Symmetry: D2
């Protein structure tokens, strides 16, 4: 089935085909002059996939308020349908990341719907940072590292349930992000809390299938405002190393202290074989969860420069999981996810253009200016023609958002789904 | 009316009276050796008040979740009852700051309940950062600075209504904090947005009584994650200077960029007569809204040092409004507000101990080391005995939290109020299907 | 000609074919977008940014300085090196002088300038360090020092800078001081600012009718607790207090972490106090790195505000543009060349923004298309425009490549003695 | 004695009465709290922190240096000044040396130290600056430099630092380098770290059985884009990779804004890699200000982890303590005196924490009472304990007051030639 009429896609592609041919041919000639085969780049670009977050498909909100748009998805099934659109138009998002219990539903049905939509499932995400109705033990003071044994046991059991759901739909990994921490000095004993967390994660690891990976995600702060158990990549490395070969670290771009050199963290985790994957998004102040590359596109390019360098250096067994983790508070979620996926492919494409041999020479000779200019020559290259052609060749849209709007999809689901009501956030009752 | 049994207060005071006498006399002797009359300090401390936020009386939450405790207040009336306790035990929070429409109710009933509880009302707070039921225009893309004229008018009208409610209950100021801004470069034109905001505020200003003040509150980010119209004190000054004499700037401690020297901003606003008031709280990362002084007590003291210096040298009827703006996500809201109000008095009392004459000398002398030590001599002084004695002499408790727990108040209201249910924040929408 | 014309000609010819192809390709793409590449190139070739005399020699940190070969011996060698930057990029006709570092006979400075085809931008005073024969030290401050005599000495220094500038063609004085405190209590914030305001008021009195006085804020360094002129808010208060000739200078690396610098630029423009810019890039503090080498988008967003100002018809808006960088690990001339290039690059992209479309997206609160409208301009590779602008004006298609081909560094290395002490 | 004993005696008697009143009052308050003030005083008397040889001279920034009077020149002058701090505070018996700045005949150094009653803490190598005659420059790095010969030179220097230390009684080598990049692409993050690890392994091999090797991480400066040993994570990787004798050194001012430093301390302790501390305070970057002058609670919170670690009986826990500060606007000796005082102040307050009560509030998730439990200790004015500890060990009740009364600064000013006066 096609969420977007194929005739609309065809029409909107033909409308822009001429210009694209001109832009692609021009870029091809320029790249050829630079000793690069544009065809080889396009080939790799059409193979780069990033998973879309189920929680980013509906309108997001802050602790102050939520302003839903029209046709908000009612649940996971509506979210999958909307994800199908993103994949149909960008062809870069074949897999969806589920979050439990937000996406709780019959696994068999989820798989059925996914297969029918041409969508797969990436890493499962557990939720022990919030309480569900009827929950026996509250996670107010923590979960996997809570002082109460019964509470830690409950959190561990929930994670095992996520794994069971994942095994039924085809997922091969579990991502664990918890809010565990403290808001006041002395509230928690840093070491004992970490010990409790490590012991609980060990139980999860014990129940982890041997064809699965366990990703732990660090975050400097929020919901905890004084200390956080898994606060940075250093603690994260200790966790992954301690748990086992199947445990790795997940890097969410917005979870670092101000001015942190994140691409270096990426390089370090790769060197020690603990880079499990990414949660892509952009930010300017905190964990803003904004559209990838919308704030600092060069940083995104520099992260991908480390990933490509890894391949260039000959690193093996390196297949990090790529996922988008964003919240869309003031835009049409589908459009933002479409362009964010595009931006990630944009950074990847530019990273592929780096003349590795030239860069290597300038680094060895300590020619800092030419070294940086070598990266800039790749980053300054407008690879949109490549991104658009990759989409066109694989069944997608030359201009995804334009086609999305021309299809009238949003108004369509707005009529099929109940209206929404704006409200406040979690700051007060 | 006494939320806390007088017999309990008296009992818990006598239980700690002997120790307090010893500590107070010891501190009194130490200060005397330092040329300071402890009684003069205690007298000023007893008179220092900070307003409590009604929205801080209930348990707070984040965008990820809310974990309510037992006996959660149902509405403004329950919250007023709970604030009565903070004031009874600390004697430092006689006034409550209201938020509309969260606390919207008959002004006569509000004023009536306040008088019965011995509570007054501080500045009103408007809410155009969220949508209410039946609202004609959404504030999703802004309010007072929204591109849509009808939306700006609705926001201005809401604020004018806040002034009306405030006039009826005894409030004398309106604090305006909005989320207006953008999440993406290009989404907003910085200049046009600010011009729209200034025009809208001008209309609100026209509705201010002669003895009222309009406080604009700056914030670097959140809910807007790229730009915010009223992002810092610089823009805040431009606003206040443009609007008029009744318009001043409100400084919320957790609303500044990392490493900002906040005490300097306070001094600058005082110098130009635009320091409207404060929203006290503490933080380490962003606008954490944590208990005042729980993270960086010295910073709080340094802010009060600027306030006391200005006071010491008599300045233009200088009377900034002191208010607490905190969210309590992992503690009993009443206990945190009690200790937060205590910390604010602690920093004030310590600031009063600074030898101003000596400090001035070291400053003109460029004796950096002795100047900083002059402040530290005051800051290092444990003034808890003064704070406790001030409370004891005015009908409060020597150890407020201890008395609060001994009274069993939380269990009491918990049995009177409906049970609450933990849930998520506004990060994602409902998902029942 | 610091760089032999035959070398510039040879290197341009070697790259002419590729430039032709890229420029024409870009031209057709822009035409399809409703933009006339010639109109953009005509504006770019006229965008100038002043080069800092103090950035022509190798810089250093408090830990060490690692000079390269042929370091300029003084201001005259520095002007000679600046002549290279201008000849190759054609984007830096003016130089920013710093007194007393560049103190010399005004007549001689001017003669070397005219001889090289260089002019002079804003003068820069120096009361953040002590010079020989100084009656009062600036250890504890300068224009805001508690000692009246010290403030007077600093005022006189600034007036001398104005006298030197008037003689060479300058039309402005930039004032950056380190005044502040390293400990709470050391300074009375308000009295320190009042002292500064009184001192600046005196300097303002020495300003010719057509001169400007720029005050530059900085969050910290050298002061590590408080700084008198710490941010744009205090800077605005200064400019507003002093008068029409007083404006604020924004140095990109002088703001708190995560600050929205482009908004500060917009705010100052709205109130007519944006005097000028000190361009550079950074990641941690006031790193003074090559412009756009770390965050090229931020640079573009700043220029987006500058071009919007013109779009909105702001009157008498002529900000001074200057580079303020230190080069510790590269050939200063090459970094200044590419930095000037980066600035013109961001400017050119700002010119490509479809302001009509953007205005529409802003009014309809279409956040996604509004940001995409900015990105459509920023993602455009304008290098062909920059290179064509240089070709037309006597510059080099590839400045650094032509610079290296000329062997200029090796030449001056043999002419200039390295300092031994 | 650098400071006449009769002066110390006179200034102690002058403040003896008030001290007695405050000590007895504090003694009674602590008694009511179940603590014996005598036990705390005994412990404080035994807490020592190393003073940096490079801290007794006046410091500066990249913009300027404003030396005071009696500036010590050379390690011998510096040792004489360090002796004053130890005599008056009795908290700094050991000095940290930096090579080549303090290079001198080991025998003479050891002899001067013994004569002044000073020992020697960890040695500090210097490959972040070039010494005259040096064969290879450290402009682009040292231990991680791309050039093999440069790395070997850096390694040899560190080995020489170990040789010097062994001769004077030192038992550890601290390695802090500026290695990194100022531009993206300039360095290959991974390869640079690999080179560093290989070089450090060579240094590790020259370590005596009873020696420790400390690596010090730093977010930035002198490198403004990336730094090889940028944070504690990389630092842990270095220590774990090198072996049991290698540990991480934590300098309070070397972390990203808002970093929770006390947590890093806890994590390093848990994994047995907390080698030591470089104490100082800051507000913006690596400001190197007097310990506790900006954020005293943070300092107390770091000590809370240290004291908890002992209370827990953690193995491999025996960190070194050193002050690493720069004094640009105060008398270096007075600042080091009060900084050592602040460090003992934080230690004393941490000792007052009711560990039993705290543990209970943590287990029951009583966050409010848990933090108030820490505050009860931190709010306690322990000055009487610090003062009595000094009085009892040959020091001064009020160190700075005695120092000033002694006229020491004027004394050395009359013995040492300033650049100009
Ligand atoms: C939804 C998801 O669990 C969540 O966003 C985490 O990955 C982390 O980014 C939270 O800040
Ligand atoms: C509830 C109140 O309006 C709010 O807290 C504001 O004062 C401001 O702090 C928001 O960040
Ligand atoms: C050299 C020049 O005065 C200086 O760079 C100032 O402009 C300012 O950037 C200092 O941080
Ligand atoms: C002088 C000493 O080696 C130096 O201060 C290092 O320890 C580190 O702090 C540098 O930033
Ligand atoms: Mn995430
Ligand atoms: Mn997140
Ligand atoms: Mn507030
Ligand atoms: Mn707030
Ligand atoms: Mn500058
Ligand atoms: Mn600067
Ligand atoms: Mn150090
Ligand atoms: Mn340092």
């Amino acid at each position: 089935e096609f969420r977007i009429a194929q005739d609309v896609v065809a029409r909107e592609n033909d409308r822009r085909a001429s210009a694209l041919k001109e832009d692609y041919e021009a870029l091809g000639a320029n790249l050829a002059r630079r000793g690069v085969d544009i065809e080889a780049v396009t080939a790799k670009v059409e193979k780069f996939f990033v998973a879309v977050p189920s929680w980013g498909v509906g309108t997001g909100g802050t602790r102050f308020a939520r302003f839903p748009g029209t046709g908000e998805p009612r649940g996971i099934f509506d979210k999958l349908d909307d994800c199908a659109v993103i994949q149909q138009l960008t062809r870069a998002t074949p897999n969806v990341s589920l979050h439990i219990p937000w996406d709780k539903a019959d696994p068999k049905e989820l798989k059925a719907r996914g297969d029918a939509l041409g969508l797969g499932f990436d890493a499962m995400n557990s939720n022990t940072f919030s309480d569900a109705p009827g929950q026996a033990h509250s996670y107010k003071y923590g979960s996997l590292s809570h002082t109460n044994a019964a509470t830690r046991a409950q959190a561990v059991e929930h994670n095992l349930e996520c794994i069971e759901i994942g095994k039924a739909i085809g997922s091969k990994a579990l991502t664990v992000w918890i809010g565990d921490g403290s808001n006041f000095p002395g509230q928690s004993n840093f070491t004992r809390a970490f010990e409790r967390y490590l012991s609980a994660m060990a139980e999860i690891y014990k129940g982890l299938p041997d064809d699965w990976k366990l990703f732990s995600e660090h975050k400097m702060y929020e919901p905890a405002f004084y200390s956080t158990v898994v606060q940075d990549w250093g603690t994260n490395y200790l966790i992954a190393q301690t748990l086992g070969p199947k445990a790795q670290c997940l890097v969410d771009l917005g979870h670092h202290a101000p001015n942190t050199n994140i691409e270096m963290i990426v390089a370090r985790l790769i060197q020690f074989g603990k880079l499990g994957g990414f949660h892509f998004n952009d930010s300017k102040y905190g964990d803003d969860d904004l559209d990838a590359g919308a704030i600092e596109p060069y940083r995104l390019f520099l992260v991908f420069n480390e990933l490509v360098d890894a391949e260039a250096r000959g690193v093996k067994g390196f297949h990090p999981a790529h996922m988008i983790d964003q919240l869309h508070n003031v835009t049409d979620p589908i459009e933002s996810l479409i362009n964010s996926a595009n931006e990630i492919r944009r950074a990847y494409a530019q990273a592929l253009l780096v003349d590795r041999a030239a860069l290597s020479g300038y680094q060895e000779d300590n020619d800092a200016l030419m070294a940086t200019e070598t990266l800039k020559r790749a980053y300054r290259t407008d690879v949109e023609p490549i991104l658009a052609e990759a989409r066109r060749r694989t069944g997608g849209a030359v201009d995804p958002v334009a086609t999305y709007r021309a299809s009238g999809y949003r108004a369509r689901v707005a009529a099929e789904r109940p209206a929404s009501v704006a409200g406040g956030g979690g700051i007060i009752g």
